[PDB]
Ligand SMILES: Nc1nc2c(c(=O)[nH]1)N(C=O)[C@@H](CNc1ccc(C(=O)N[C@@H](CCC(=O)O)C(=O)O)cc1)CN2
Ligand SMILES: Nc1nc2c(c(=O)[nH]1)N(C=O)[C@@H](CNc1ccc(C(=O)N[C@@H](CCC(=O)O)C(=O)O)cc1)CN2
Ligand SMILES: [Cl-]
């Protein structure tokens with residue numbers, strides 16, 4: 001087979017050549033296309049992109065915090081991972097009109113929705129225990145008890161909650177599906193920062209599928225990535241033109257280091273990325 | 289060449305017949321299934337109503353107008369001559385899900401409810417929901433009118449809080465609009481596709497919805513992109529589909545809107561005309577209740 005990384009590089013090239021120029025909320029400007037699809041195998045490989053060093057600590061800390069149910073950027077920041085920080089700052093918060101919120105309180109984003117869909121948000125500090133729908137645990141429970149079920153969904157798109165989010169979910173909705181003894185996942189990504197977010201988001205969902213496969217006794221299958229609004233910010237064009245000239249090296253493997261029973265017990269130290277040989281880091285700026 | 293138009297649907301069928309996995313399902317029918325497919329249907333001077341069989345267009349049109357009104361009552365649809373929801377609202381079905389105290393035809397907070405009242409507290413199918421919840425459809429329209437650059441133009445029917453009250457959770461789960469070159473496109477995330485019966489309706493339906501929104505926003509329809517999660521043929525569809533896969537698609541019909549409409553709720557059935565529709569004969573297929 002060809003390297004799966006070529007799909008992503010394919011997507012980049014496609015946007016650079018035929019994407020429309022639009023204005024955007026962030027002021028940066030973008031090139032954008034609508035409606036793309038890639039399929040990354042998870043069978044004895046893991047799609048951490050190799051044409052640039054991806055911040056793997058970032059992906060892994062990020063997801064654990066999602067699982068944790070946290071909406072507090074500083075709880076992520078404590079770990080070495082400054083990715084959510086700008087969306088959670090005094091400045092940004094004030095520019096959305098959220099003058100009462102504390103520094104780092106992103107609103108009812110991913111963690112809250114994955115774990116407590118439907119609950120009344122208050123602040124990142126509240127104890128939301130027992131409240132809302134625990135979509136994640138229900139996914140796991142469905143995979144174990146009725147793997148043939150056609151409703152195995154986790155949705156972060158909460159239209160009621162939209163007005164309180166520092167930012168509405170880019171990765172809006174996933175579906176898992178079991179065939180033979182393999183667990184697959186399809187992500188519907190309504191909005192894809194192709195330069196910065198998407199490398200993270202791909203690894204993020206591949207890693208989630210690995211975790212759920214581990215605790216359900218399934219083997220991981222495919223991660224299918226459906227994009228809606230896929231954009232390159234203009235300050236990413238030159239950076240990605242550098243990236244486009246690199247040859248993918250073989251994807252690494254993800255190793256899980258102990259039998260873990262419940263999604264909540266996973267710790268950063270339970271994972272090891274083996275045989276990851278990326279090209280150098282390419283600094284790209286985050287559009288705020 | 290890679291397939292285009294109806295050929296995508298036909299090839300989707302062939303792939304499930306030759307490739308899908310045999311599973312038992314909630315209906316007891318059995319299915320063949322496959323996970324994660326995609327098709328792109330042009331809406332430019334063509335309307336994707338399948339020609340390899342006669343699709344019940346009035347069904348499609350009457351089902352979408354019912355969605356838009358925000359009805360959750362099978363009988364309001366049934367009374368228009370369109371029976372496709374009756375089985376999912378019958379006494380027996382409702383009871384089998386434990387809804388004994390609920391009136392026949394009360395589907396719960398399904399599609400129409402979520403589009404125009406997302407997050408409101410569902411009472412019964414009879415309640416006035418005038419001005420409660422999030423009106424997603426109206427929000428779609430207005431953001432298209434005023435900020436086409438917005439990468440958050442989304443109508444989502446998937447409501448985890450409301451699932452336990454639904455006759456059936458949404459098969460067409462979420463949709464997103466996109467605007468380029470004064471053209472309106474729409475991607476649909478269909479978590480569950482009944483490939484022989486519902487999927488022909490769904491395509492026609494999203495394409496319909498896109499024509500109406502294009503029409504009220506001063507845009508021209510572009511593309512309908514169809515993303516399938518779980519895609520499945522019911523076993524007792526297999527022989528009927530074998531007739532269908534024998535036939536050559538004919539060119540798609542055109543859809544004409546008959547008058548200048550300003551508001552979404554203003555559309556009536558009389559406003560649409562399908563022109564040059566030329567299907568091979570209806571192929572009947574039993575529904576999986
Ligand atoms: N513009 C934008 N904002 C967003 C997202 C996004 O994808 N794009 N997100 C949705 O995903 C969240 C943030 N995700 C992010 C993922 C990676 C990086 C980033 O700066 N990547 C660098 C830095 C790595 C490091 O910190 O050492 C890199 O990989 O080069 C930033 C945000 C919320 N806000
Ligand atoms: N099994 C099943 N249940 C479902 C759906 C579905 O697609 N399949 N739906 C999600 O979409 C909803 C109803 N949609 C339907 C659309 C068409 C037909 C059907 O029987 N089609 C016949 C109609 C013929 C006629 O009425 O004249 C046909 O097209 O031959 C049934 C349900 C609710 N539950
Ligand atoms: Cl609650």
Ligand SMILES: [Cl-]
Nearest residue numbers: 053279280281
């Ligand atoms: Cl480096």
Ligand SMILES: [Cl-]
Nearest residue numbers: 535536537538
């Ligand atoms: Cl012919």
